Amino acid sequence: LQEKWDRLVSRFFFNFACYLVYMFIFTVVAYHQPSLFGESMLLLGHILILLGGIYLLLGQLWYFWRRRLFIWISFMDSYFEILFLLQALLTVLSQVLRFMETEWYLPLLVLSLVLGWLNLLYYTRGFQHTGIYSVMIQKVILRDLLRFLLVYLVFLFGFAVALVSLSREAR
């Protein structure tokens, strides 16, 4: 597997560079959105976003068709692909809401940008130090964070209702 990785690391970093360029183009267009030569350039950028989103969606759908049982077998090894699916369809969906000229095309684009920048952590498995780092971020800390969030949300809701009900009476 070390020999196979040493032979395929050039394609790994090529995919990394393509994804980084796609997110740079997606960031530039989202930064220059109009109020809801420059217009033609923005339309070309939106076309490039739609093409990249369709490409990512088709690739992820092919992966899910080939590896349908892998999600049920191991969620902690097939979750980035899920994320690589999700924002991808969001990348499509917002553009659909751009075609209909509605209000909610911009929040979907913003969530697509955020989830795309969180999806850049996949390629950190290409290096050994960041690869060991990325193991802890979803394996051990996650269950503790979910139980802590559950207890904190219970306490927060109870105390919030308490201070709401107690502060209504004036002096």
Ligand X SMILES: CCCCCCCCCC(=O)OC[C@H](COP(=O)([O-])OCCN)OC(=O)CCCCCCCCC
Q: Which residues bind a second copy (CB under 8 A)?
A: 27, 30-31, 33, 35-36, 106-107, 109-110, 113-114, 116-118, 120-121, 124, 129-130, 133, 143, 147, 150-151, 154-155, 157-159, 161-162, 164-166, 168-169
Contact status: 84 vs ligand X (CB under 6 A):
yes
Closest CA to 123 of 4, 27, 21: 21
Residue 84 · residue 119 · CB < 8 Å: yes
- Which residues have CB under 8 Å from 11's CB, separation 6+? none
* Stretch touching ligand X by CB under 6 A, among 12-20, 35-43, 98-106, 153-161: 12-20
Regarding 94 and contact with ligand X (CB under 6 A), the answer is no
Query: Which residue, 13 or 148, is less far from ligand X as judged by CB?
Result: 13
143 binds, among a second copy, ligand X, none (CB under 5 to 8 A by kind): a second copy
Query: In whole angstroms, how close is the CB of 66 to a second copy at the nearest point?
Result: 30
109 binds ligand X (CB under 6 A): no
Breaks (C-N over 2.5 A) in the chain follow: 36
Q: Which is nearer to a second copy, 3 or 39 (CB)?
A: 39
Q: How far is the CB of 6 from a second copy (least distance, A)?
A: 23
| Positions that interact with ligand X (CB under 6 A) | 15, 18-19, 21-22, 51-52, 55-56, 80-81, 84, 122
